RNA sequence: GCCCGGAUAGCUCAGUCGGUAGAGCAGCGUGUCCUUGGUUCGAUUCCGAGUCCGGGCACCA
């Protein structure tokens, strides 16, 4: 818009996940204000994160919010995700832009169903690192309860291939730190240090062909249509031609400006949360789940063989088997598509807790490749987690 | 192919659709009998058309609703399975779990319903388990998921006490009427007081003991005892009997009228005996009074419970308040009931306390959620509460939605409970009317009056204000009973003064009606100052002005009307105070979750709380293996215990069984059965334990399948134990183990659960299996249908009831089943069809001739059909390669039963031991009760073989005894028994002496020089060892499987097998028969595999013959080498090739079997030498 | 992105106490009621998700 976004520090994409009402938005506000006290910062408030009228009315986060803050060594784009089970899809989209996740677990509650669900979904959408912030430690004076919560969270993290015994856990209080209690702002500073150290600087593919999964579409008045998201690979520059691939027929356009947190950029690099302005496309012709690609570099597909683990009842999955013709929703990076399932020869039903090799045919072509992890959701619950073994058509 | 196998398995092996239809028909015919159940219950199950489902209303009783749901589930499952047969996995799964949902309904279903339903639904439990197991292999394979026993032959094991107990007891007491009356009482007490399993009357032992004691015995004490029996004991027994029949729903007097007649006869004879030694009518006045008082108390209980509306109103208020929250207010509360205001929580708790049991019965988990959300303090954190994972899953849900989703079910349950109470009240009314009718009929159909009746006493109430609920409830029920008494008195007044007006608009003729009418309101007329009128009327009506007693009709009517009004007002006051006391006691008690406690009692919770697994494990580890170590010979004990004193628990689930001796294999199978029983019981108890206070238990249909699977395993294992218990040396410990599992036969959802073999040509069996896969018979079926329609269309003067139509339909079905597997000879079909046509013509002309000619013609038809079917069955037996006289007898029996039914509905060594006991007991009685001693001896010595020579010895010794009618005969009998017991011991691995000493002790106890008997036994042992050393079973089986050319054939065949995997290559294949000619079935099978051209039928038949030769040995290697399922899968030539490969791959296991036979001989010689050493030691020590 | 409402024969539609879908027209209906699951003895019917369509809100790199 006005500034130019001088590039000084390495950029990391982090975000808050966890069960509903456990303190993710308060943690984001506290982090930003404490870092603005200690360093430059911007000091965003709670109301500026949850600003939609529906969010204020219901008192919950509904859509993911984006903030930025700078430690001395890093620049962080932070995604605040909803915790309510009804809006898990939105959280998934946020979790698709995360190089790291802060798992907010309330000490007064401990791990909850959405804690496990968010861990699993972030694992499926590519979150490689999790830091636990034990929130609401100003309401739990007991230490045995804190140790029990810590061990439960570590076991839950280890259940999904995260290094539970190595994941840092911060016993803090987002509300007290936001209020101004210095003893509790030290915990936010420790969490920022853990963000700096525990999460390594990601290796970005700035040489591969450009690719950007679309997370949100805006209609900027007087400018046009902007697609926001994290550049998976490559570099997008102003004036370059791009293709919109995915749900509908692939379209062609040109990039007429790249921004990043309302600051002009000459080129958008891999791993950066950027907004790209496209020439001559209406807001209704693009949607979340489509992909911006270099022309002639991505072919959408509908059919693929995959190895899928079906969650058990105790993990929040199905409690009954499903048969051929099951039509659940498949969640790739920012895409959710209805698909039909074909079971392997000799198998007619799949029980909860099973590992199967099935062929999925989606109702719309989407951009995907071998080794791309995905989630399966149906009836408002996660029912499976698989990886694309190979692409058929 | 797999789906076709599943479909054929469902249609022909399980026959699930037919089983469901039969169970539904039997249940519906039993619950609409009208001779066992009252018409009140039967009217609920009347349908305009049989194709419509039963409609479950909120206004029908609870048990009627359960029965309707079960019948609908059975019909739906039958429909789904029949649709499957007409063509699949999803449909079968849905039908199976609908049956399981019905079973879960039965699990929570009020043991009266359980005993009504169990005998019928027990017929498909193994079928459901097998269907679920078959469905399980369409899913991905899960190793160690079940880890249970292999269900080898379960498909072949697929399978009035209450009304007769009391009459039998009172008949026995009738039979009990110096020392003669001193042991009969003991015998009767032992016979009757030991009986149980039907004591739903929760006092039975007290009545039996008190009645026996009183029947064992100035006249004042005897009269007091008689009145105690007549007024306290027998009325209580009758009232409990009526309670049982009312809870069941049976017709009035079904099991109370025969019992009542029996006790009436017993009491009359006892009173006659007492009078002869020195009143007795059993229905004088006060037996009737007490019976009617109890009946009215129960009726008022039911009516009060039915007219209660506080629970339903409280549930409605609770659900309205919970549903009054919109989306905004739910969001403000964070969709949790714990976040609402304290006053709202108090109101919700007040509402919920009144209907918590109904909510918790259906939703044990939502009940806990509601209790924790409403009663916990908000200050306490969730972490300290230590909630479980699934409890936290339920806790995170929208609480308002979860509670609101229970509204329809909870309201339906409450209204159905009210309907159940009203239906029980109607049943009690019918019972009261029938009891009055029987009381009238039993004496003379006449009534007797008395002027010494205590007048009416209208009770008044001076009641406290701070007393518990029962205090006011008792007074309410007393007032209601008095209201009923006054009501019947006023009805009697109306009848009396209507009959008087209608018979004469005191020296009359039909004084019985006036007597019975005045007996109802005599106390009320005596309450007013009318004693003179009462004493002037009783005598006048028992021995002989009617114009003056009609004057005081309005007065007595007004008295009754005002007394009823006062009682009603007092009842309203008492009800108000009782409701206030109920509110106070609800406020005092804190709210506590009830779901787990209710789940602990369903049917499987009761079985789980028995801890049968612990007792089974204790017997297995302490009583079973100790007996095994003590009794088994060391050689046999070595194979079971490598530690010398404990079973090899590292390898308890043995799986080979073909490298062991028959006795060792039997012991290993017994150990496997005990282990599987223990594991299944432990798993069942773990799944049905609800002792975690921090966990929720969701009620669902998808657990019953697991339960059923476990039950199946246990029963399967238990079956083998019984099979292992049919051995002389293993009866005791096996019987003890089964006594431990006794509390399993009796639970409705398990029961017996199981059953508790031809040899035909291999080609014939394969063709039969192929025919049953691909599914004259049509002609005979059409003829039977024509016969059935001719019988149905019979509209002549000889009316045929619909029951007879159903009976002839059942007979025609049985006949069709019997003849469906019958092959007819040339011209036999014509003869049988002509005979059946003549039979159907006769049936169509039943009314056209006299009954004598009809019966003669049908007898001739029966004889002709029986002869023709005998001949056809013999032809089929010859052509199927079976044994003569087996199938023909069954066919003739089917024909005879069919014809007898049609004419009716249209208007052993055990014997040797019994003979031995009879002769030995008649020897002293003829040279100086018996049946009981003989039966006890035979039962205690059941299981002896007696061989073919000892039979002649027994006959000769019995002849000698008969000729002579001293100890020589008894010695011969004893040594015959000892030889049989030695055979039994040697067949098992028992140590020498034990069972033989046991049987000898039993024989000598029943009875009330030794060196010769010991020498005879020693000679028997030496000859047995000599015979064993001559055994050549191993070499014979080796020769039979692969003769003395196997090594050379294998060596010259391996290159050919390699060549199997160009133009001149076939030359060696053609010329192999001049250098590698097979001589044994295994080598012939290898050559056939070399041929590989299984398309032709010649080599298919050759493979069938080779498999027929090899099957008796392969069946020990694996149970799947049977003659039914193995032949069923041989459809395509590729299947034949696969079977040939599978049989070829088992040469190593066949060699292992031969080595195991050699080891069996090696062990048998050691057992024989140990027995001989023991016997020579005993002989040398005895001198 | 968040709500709301619809989808039943070739066309127009009734079916609501949850008990096998029927009226007109068109030329006597395997239309299990858009699809997928769940609850239920039983689902067009109740609950959820999804695919289209319609119109109300939100937002603005
Ligand atoms: N005592 C205490 N309260 C806290 C703390 N952190 C958050 N809260 C309270 O918990 C509530 C949770 O609010 P949010 O932080 O917005 O919840 P969320 O993590 O965003 O979860 P969503 O509603 O799904 O977005 C807030 O109203 C805070 O008042 C804490 O550290 N200590
Ligand atoms: Mg939030």
Nucleic strand C contacts from chain A, 143-162, CB < 7 Å: none
CA distances from A266 to A211, A221, B1129 (A): 17, 21, 72
Nearest Cα to Cα of residue B83 among B17, B3, B13: B17
3-class DSSP string for chain A: CCCCCCCCCCEEEEEEECCCCCCHHHHHHHHHHHHHHHCCCCCCCHHHHCCCHHHHHHCCCCCCEEEEEECCCCEEEEEECCCCHHHHHHHHHHHCCCCEEEEEEECCCCCCHHHHHHHHHHHHCCCCCEEEEEECCCCCCCHHHHHHHHHHHHHHHHHCCCCCCCCCEEECCHHHHHHCCHHHHHHHHHHHHHHHHHCCCCCCECCCCCEEECCEEEEECCCEEEEEEECCECCEECCCEEEEECCCCCEEEEEEEEECCCCEECEECCCCEEEEEECCCCHHHCCECEEEECCCCCCCEEEEEEEEEECCHHHCCCCCCEECCCCCEEECCCCEEEEEEECCCCCCEECCCCEEEEEEEEEEEECCCCCCEEEEEECCEEEEEEEEEEECC
Taking a C-beta distance cutoff of 8 angstroms, is the pair B360, B424 a contact? no
Catalogue the long-range contacts made by B508-517 (C-beta closer than 8 Å, 24 or more residues apart). B508/B544, B508/B546, B511/B541, B511/B542, B512/B446, B512/B447, B514/B541, B515/B446, B515/B447, B515/B448, B515/B449, B515/B541, B515/B542, B516/B440, B516/B447, B517/B492, B517/B493
Nearest Cα to Cα of residue B13 among B117, B164, B136, B127: B127
CA distances from A134 to A18, A104, A107, A158, A188 (A): 11, 6, 6, 17, 11
B484 is a domain residue: yes
Nearest Cα to Cα of residue B971 among B921, B1022, B1011, B912: B1011
CA distances from A79 to A24, A50, A199, A293, B741 (A): 10, 12, 16, 24, 62
Resolution in A: 2.7
Nucleic strand C contacts from chain B, 3-62, CB < 7 Å: 51-58
CATH label of the domain that carries residue A378: 2.40.30.10
Residue B379: Cβ within 10 Å count: 6
A215 and A193 part of one domain: no
Cβ of B72 less than 7 A from strand C: yes
Residue B650: Cβ within 10 Å count: 7
DSSP string across B240-287: HHHHHHHHHTBPTTTTTHHHHHHHHHHHHHHHHHHHHH----S-SSHH
Which residues touch B574 (CB under 8 Å, ≥6 apart)? Answer: B461, B463, B472, B475, B476, B479
B99 CA → C20 C1’, Å: 20
Find which nucleotide's C1' atom is closest to A322's CA. C37
A305 and A262 part of one domain: no
A129 is a domain residue: yes
Query: What is the C-alpha radius of gyration for chain B, rounded to an integer number of angstroms?
Result: 39
Residue finishing a domain among B110, B126, B159: B159
d(CA B217, CA B504): 54
d(CA B485, CA A278): 95
Return the structure tokens found at B1109.
């030769």
The residue written with tokens 């002769």 in the block is: B919
B556 and B648 part of one domain: no
Pairing outcome for strands A322-323 and A336-342: unpaired
A362 and A240 part of one domain: no
A248 and A306 part of one domain: no
A212 and A257 part of one domain: yes
| Dihedral sign (CA B975, B980, B981, B985) | positive
**Residue A208, marked binder:** no
d(CA B343, CA B144): 54
> How many structural domains does chain B have?
8
Cβ of A48 less than 7 A from strand C: no
Taking a C-beta distance cutoff of 8 angstroms, is the pair B811, B901 a contact? yes
Residue B689: Cβ within 10 Å count: 16
Return the structure tokens found at B741.
């599992």
B1028 is a domain residue: no
d(CA B687, CA B772): 40
The residue written with tokens 């969010």 in the block is: A55
Burial bucket for residue B870 (CB in 10 Å: 0-12, 13-18, 19+): middle
Range of the domain at B890: 792-905
A142 and A281 part of one domain: no
Taking a C-beta distance cutoff of 8 angstroms, is the pair A12, A100 a contact? yes
Return the structure tokens found at B284.
């004088």
DSSP string across B847-876: TTS-HHHHHHHHHHHHHHHHHHHHHHHHHH
Return the structure tokens found at B946.
């007696």
Residue B1068: Cβ within 10 Å count: 12
| Dihedral sign (CA B37, B40, B41, B45) | positive
B585 and B610 part of one domain: no
What is residue B183's three-state secondary structure? helix
d(CA B114, CA B708): 16
A175 and A307 part of one domain: no
B1154 is a domain residue: yes
Taking a C-beta distance cutoff of 8 angstroms, is the pair A28, A16 a contact? yes
A31 and A117 part of one domain: yes
Distance in Å, CA A231 to ligand 2 centroid: 24
- State which ligand 1 atom lies nearest to the alpha carbon of A83: 24
B402 and B450 part of one domain: no
A3 is a domain residue: no
Which residues touch A319 (CB under 8 Å, ≥6 apart)? Answer: A313, A352, B700, B702
Pairing outcome for strands A355-366 and A336-342: antiparallel
**Shortest CA gap A57–chain B (Å):** 7
Nearest Cα to Cα of residue B915 among B887, B900, B896, B934: B934
Which residues touch B562 (CB under 8 Å, ≥6 apart)? Answer: none
- H/E stretch holding B708: helix B704-725
* Cα three-residue angle A227-A231-A234, rounded to 5 degrees: 125
Taking a C-beta distance cutoff of 8 angstroms, is the pair B1013, B752 a contact? no
- Please give the torsion angle defined by the CA atoms of residues B861, B862, B867 and B870, in that order, rounded to the nearest 10 degrees: 140
Residue finishing a domain among A299, A317, A339: A299
Question: Using a 6 Å cutoff on CB, does residue A83 contact ligand 1?
Answer: yes
Nearest Cα to Cα of residue B977 among B953, B961, B1010: B953
| Dihedral sign (CA B840, B846, B849, B852) | positive
A210 and A183 part of one domain: no
What counts of helices (H) and strands (E) characterise chain B? 55, 0
A1 is a domain residue: no
A352 and A252 part of one domain: no
Residue finishing a domain among B557, B591, B625: B591
DSSP string across B623-683: IIHHHHHHHB-HHHHHHH-SSSSS--GGG-S----SSS-HHHHHHHHHHHHHHHHHHHHHH
Question: Using a 6 Å cutoff on CB, does residue A28 contact ligand 1?
Answer: no
d(CA B200, CA B241): 9
B227 and B260 part of one domain: yes
Residue in chain B lying closest to A147 (CA): B383
B121 is a domain residue: yes
B293 is a domain residue: no
Which residues touch B560 (CB under 8 Å, ≥6 apart)? Answer: B486, B489, B490, B493, B521, B524
Return the structure tokens found at B93.
């799964």
CB contact under 8 A, B139 and A348: yes
Residue finishing a domain among A299, A329, A345: A299
A293 is a domain residue: yes
CA distances from B634 to B174, B639, B789, B898 (A): 58, 9, 70, 57
φ, ψ of residue A226 in degrees (nearest 5): -115, 130
Burial bucket for residue A252 (CB in 10 Å: 0-12, 13-18, 19+): exposed
d(CA B628, CA B833): 62
Q: Any idea which ligand is nearest the CA of A60?
A: 1
B406 is a domain residue: yes
A255 and A116 part of one domain: no
A119 is a domain residue: yes
d(CA B195, CA B210): 16
Q: Which residues of A77-116 are buried (b: 16+ CB within 10 A; e: fewer)?
A: bbbbbbbbbebbebbbbbbbbbbbbbbbbbbbbbbbbbbb
CATH label of the domain that carries residue A117: 3.40.50.300
CA distances from B325 to B27, B344, B388, B407 (A): 46, 12, 28, 15
Residue finishing a domain among A299, A333, A368: A299
The residue written with tokens 């009238």 in the block is: B440
Taking a C-beta distance cutoff of 8 angstroms, is the pair B865, B838 a contact? no
B647 and B740 part of one domain: yes
**Shortest CA gap B140–chain A (Å):** 6
Range of the domain at A360: 300-392
Cβ of A319 less than 7 A from strand C: yes
Nearest Cα to Cα of residue B993 among B1001, B1003, B985: B985
Question: Using a 6 Å cutoff on CB, does residue A63 contact ligand 1?
Answer: no
Q: Which nucleotides of C are covered by protein (CB under 7 A)?
A: 1-3, 17, 19-20, 35-42, 48-52, 57-61
Taking a C-beta distance cutoff of 8 angstroms, is the pair B599, B676 a contact? no
* Strand partners for A366: A301
d(CA A377, CA A393): 23
> How many structural domains does chain A have?
3
B798 and B892 part of one domain: yes
Confirm whether A93 is a catalytic residue: no
d(CA B425, CA B304): 9
φ, ψ of residue A108 in degrees (nearest 5): -70, -15
B14 and B65 part of one domain: yes
Nucleic strand C contacts from chain B, 699-738, CB < 7 Å: 699-702
DSSP state for residue B405 in the 8-state scheme: T
A188 is a domain residue: yes
B916 and B898 part of one domain: no
A56 CA → C50 C1’, Å: 29
A25 and A167 part of one domain: yes
What is residue B54's three-state secondary structure? coil
d(CA A43, CA A46): 10
């Amino acid at each position: 818009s006005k500034e130019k976004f001088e590039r000084t520090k390495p950029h990391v994409n982090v975000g808050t996940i966890g069960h509903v009402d456990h303190g993710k938005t308060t943690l984001t506000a506290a982090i930003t204000t404490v870092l603005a006290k200690t360093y430059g910062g911007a000091a965003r408030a709670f109301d500026q994160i949850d600003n939609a009228p529906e969010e204020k009315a219901r008192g919950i986060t509904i859509n993911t919010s984006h903030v930025e803050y700078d430690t001395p060594t890093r620049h962080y784009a932070h995604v605040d995700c909803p915790g309510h089970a009804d809006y898990v899809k939105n959280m998934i989209t946020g979790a698709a832009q995360m190089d790291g996740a802060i798992l907010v677990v309330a000490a007064t509650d401990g791990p909850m169903p959405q804690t496990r669900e968010h861990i699993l979904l972030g694992r499926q959408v590519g979150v490689p690192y999790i830091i636990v912030f034990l929130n609401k430690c100003d309401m739990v004076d007991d230490e045995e309860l804190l140790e029990l919560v810590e061990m439960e969270v570590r076991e839950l993290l280890s259940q999904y291939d995260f290094p539970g015994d190595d994941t840092p856990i911060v016993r803090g209080s987002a509300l007290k730190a936001l209020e101004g209690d210095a003893e509790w702002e030290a915990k936010i500073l420790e969490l920022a240090g853990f963000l700096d150290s525990y999460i390594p600087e990601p290796e970005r593919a700035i040489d591969k062909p450009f690719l950007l999964p679309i997370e949100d579409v805006f209609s900027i008045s007087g400018r046009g249509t902007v697609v926001t998201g994290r550049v998976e690979r490559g570099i997008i520059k102003v004036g370059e031609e791009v293709e919109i691939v995915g749900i509908k027929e692939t379209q062609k356009s040109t990039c007429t400006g790249v921004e990043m947190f309302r600051k002009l950029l000459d080129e958008g690099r891999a791993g950066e949360n950027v907004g790209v302005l496209l020439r001559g496309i209406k807001r209704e012709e693009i949607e979340r789940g489509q992909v911006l690609a270099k022309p002639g570099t991505i072919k959408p597909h509908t059919k693929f063989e995959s190895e899928v683990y079906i969650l058990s009842k105790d993990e929040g999955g199905r409690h009954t088997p499903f048969f051929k013709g099951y039509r659940p929703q498949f969640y790739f990076r920012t895409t959710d598509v209805t698909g039909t399932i074909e079971l392997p020869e000799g198998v007619e039903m799949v029980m909860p807790g099973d590992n199967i090799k099935m062929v999925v045919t989606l109702i719309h072509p989407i951009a995907m490749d071998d080794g791309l992890r995905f989630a399966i959701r149906e009836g408002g619950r996660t029912v499976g987690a698989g990886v694309v073994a190979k692409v058929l058509s | 192919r797999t789906i076709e196998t599943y479909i054929i398995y469902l249609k022909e092996d399980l026959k699930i659709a037919d089983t469901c239809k039969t169970i539904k028909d039997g249940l519906l015919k039993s619950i609409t009998d009208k001779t066992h159940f009252s018409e009140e219950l039967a009217t609920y199950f009347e349908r305009d058309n049989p194709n419509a489902p039963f409609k479950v209303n909120t206004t029908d009783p609870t048990q009627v609703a359960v029965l309707k749901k079960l019948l609908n589930a059975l019909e739906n499952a039958e429909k789904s399975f029949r649709a499957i047969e007409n063509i699949a996995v999803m449909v079968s799964y849905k039908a199976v779990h609908e049956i399981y949902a019905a079973l879960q309904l039965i699990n929570h279903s009020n043991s009266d319903i359980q005993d009504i339903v169990g005998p019928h639904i027990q017929k498909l439990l193994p079928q459901m388990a097998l269907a679920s197991k078959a469905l399980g292999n369409f899913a991905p394979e899960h190793p160690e998921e079940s880890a249970g026993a292999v269900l080898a032959g379960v498909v072949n094991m697929l399978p009035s006490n209450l009304i007769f107990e009391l009459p039998h007891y009172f008949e026995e007491l009738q039979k009990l009427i110096m020392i003669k009356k001193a042991n009969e009482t003991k015998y009767y007490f032992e016979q009757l007081s030991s009986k149980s399993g039907l004591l739903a009357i929760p006092s039975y032992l007290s009545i039996v003991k008190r009645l026996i004691a009183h029947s064992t015995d100035a006249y004042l004490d005897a009269v007091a005892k008689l009145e105690d029996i007549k007024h306290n004991i027998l009325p209580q027994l009758i009232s409990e009997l009526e309670m049982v029949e009312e809870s069941m729903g049976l017709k009035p007097g079904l099991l109370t009228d025969p019992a009542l007649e029996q006790m009436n006869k017993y009491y009359t004879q006892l009173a006659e005996q007492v009078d002869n030694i020195a009143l007795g009518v059993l229905m004088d006045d006060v037996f009737i009074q007490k019976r009617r008082s109890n009946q009215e108390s129960r009726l008022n209980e039911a009516r009060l419970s039915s007219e209660d509306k506080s629970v339903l109103a409280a549930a409605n208020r609770f659900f309205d308040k919970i549903g009054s929250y919109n989306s905004i207010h739910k969001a403000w509360s964070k969709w949790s009931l714990a976040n609402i205001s304290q006053s709202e929580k108090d109101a919700l708790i007040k509402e919920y306390k009144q209907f918590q049991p109904h909510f918790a019965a259906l939703y044990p988990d939502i009940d806990k959620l509601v209790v924790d959300a409403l009663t916990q303090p908000t200050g306490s954190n969730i972490v300290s509460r230590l909630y479980s994972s699934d409890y936290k899953q339920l806790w995170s849900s929208d609480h308002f939605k979860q509670v609101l989703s229970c509204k329809d079910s909870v309201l339906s349950s409450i209204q159905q409970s009210l309907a159940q109470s009203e239906f029980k009240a109607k049943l009690i009314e019918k019972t009261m009317s029938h009891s009055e009718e029987t009381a009238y009929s039993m004496n003379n159909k006449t009534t007797n009056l008395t002027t010494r009746v205590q007048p009416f006493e209208p009770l008044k109430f001076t009641l406290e204000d701070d007393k518990p609920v029962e205090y006011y409830h008792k007074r309410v029920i007393a007032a209601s009973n008095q209201i009923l008494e006054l009501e019947r008195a006023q009805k009697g007044v109306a009848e009396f003064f209507n009959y008087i007006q209608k018979k004469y608009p005191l020296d009359e003729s039909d004084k019985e009606f006036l007597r019975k009418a005045y007996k109802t309101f005599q106390p009320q007329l005596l309450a007013l100052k009318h004693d003179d009128i009462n004493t002037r009327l009783v005598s006048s009506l028992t021995s002989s002005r009617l114009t003056d007693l009609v004057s005081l009709k309005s007065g007595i009517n007004d008295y009754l009307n005002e007394k009823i009004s006062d009682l009603n007002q007092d009842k309203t006051t008492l009800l108000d105070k009782e409701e206030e006391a109920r509110e106070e006691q609800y406020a005092k008690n804190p709210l506590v979750a009830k779901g787990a406690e209710l789940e602990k009692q369903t049917l499987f919770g009761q079985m789980s709380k028995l801890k049968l697994s612990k007792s089974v494990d204790d017997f297995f580890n302490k009583k079973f293996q100790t007996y095994l170590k003590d009794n088994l010979s060391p050689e046999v004990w070595k194979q079971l215990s490598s530690n010398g004193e404990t079973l090899d628990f590292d390898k308890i689930p043995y799986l080979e069984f073909h490298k062991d001796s028959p006795e060792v294999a039997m012991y290993k199978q017994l150990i496997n059965s005990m282990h599987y029983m223990k594991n299944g019981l432990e798993k069942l108890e773990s799944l049905n334990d609800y002792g975690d206070p921090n966990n929720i238990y969701h009620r669902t249909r998808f657990v019953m399948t697991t339960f059923n699977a476990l039950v199946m395993n246990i029963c399967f294992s238990k079956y083998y134990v019984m099979e292992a218990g049919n051995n002389p040396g293993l009866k005791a410990i096996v019987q003890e183990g089964l006594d431990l599992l006794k509390p399993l036969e009796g639970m409705p959802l398990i029961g017996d659960y199981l059953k508790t073999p031809p040899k035909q040509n291999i080609i014939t069996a394969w063709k039969k299996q192929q025919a049953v896969v691909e599914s004259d018979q049509q002609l005979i079926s059409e003829q039977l249908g024509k016969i059935q329609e001719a019988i149905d269309n019979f509209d002549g003067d000889l009316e045929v009831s619909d029951s007879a139509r159903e009976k002839i339909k059942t007979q025609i079905g049985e006949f069709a089943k019997g003849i469906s597997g019958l092959s007819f000879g040339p011209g036999s079909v014509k003869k049988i069809l002509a005979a059946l046509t003549k039979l159907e013509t006769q049936l169509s002309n039943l009314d056209k001739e006299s009954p004598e000619v009809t019966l003669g013609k049908l007898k001739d038809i029966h004889s002709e059909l029986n002869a023709q079917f005998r001949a056809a069955a013999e032809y089929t037996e010859y052509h199927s390669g079976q044994k003569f006289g087996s199938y023909s007898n069954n066919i003739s029996t089917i024909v005879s039963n069919f014809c007898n039914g049609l004419v009716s509905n249209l208007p052993k060594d055990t014997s040797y031991l019994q003979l031995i006991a009879e002769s030995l007991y008649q020897i002293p009685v003829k040279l100086n009760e018996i049946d009981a001693n003989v039966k006890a001896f035979v039962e205690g010595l059941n299981g002896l073989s007696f061989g073919p020579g000892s039979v002649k010895k027994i006959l000769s010794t019995a002849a000698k005894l008969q000729m002579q009618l001293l100890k020589e005969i008894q010695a011969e009998f004893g040594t015959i028994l000892m030889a049989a017991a030695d055979n039994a011991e040697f067949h098992l691995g028992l140590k020498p002496g034990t069972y033989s000493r046991t049987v000898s002790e039993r024989f000598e106890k029943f009875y009330s020089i030794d060196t010769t008997s010991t020498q005879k036994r020693l000679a028997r042992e030496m000859e047995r060892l000599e015979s064993v050393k001559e055994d050549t079973s191993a070499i014979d089986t080796k020769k039979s499987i692969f003769g003395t050319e196997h090594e050379q054939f294998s060596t010259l065949y391996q290159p050919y097998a390699s060549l199997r995997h160009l133009h001149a290559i076939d030359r060696v294949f053609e010329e192999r028969h001049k250098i590698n000619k097979p001589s044994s079935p295994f080598d012939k099978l290898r050559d056939l595999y070399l041929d590989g051209d299984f398309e032709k039928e010649e080599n298919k038949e050759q493979f069938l013959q080779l498999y027929a030769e090899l099957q008796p040995h392969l069946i020990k290697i694996n149970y799947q080498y049977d003659l039914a399922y193995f032949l069923r899968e041989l459809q395509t030539p590729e299947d034949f090739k696969a079977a040939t490969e599978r049989i070829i791959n088992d040469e190593s296991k066949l060699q292992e079997l031969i080595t195991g036979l050699d080891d069996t001989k090696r062990l048998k010689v050691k057992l024989c030498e140990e027995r001989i050493g023991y016997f020579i030691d005993l002989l040398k020590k005895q001198e």
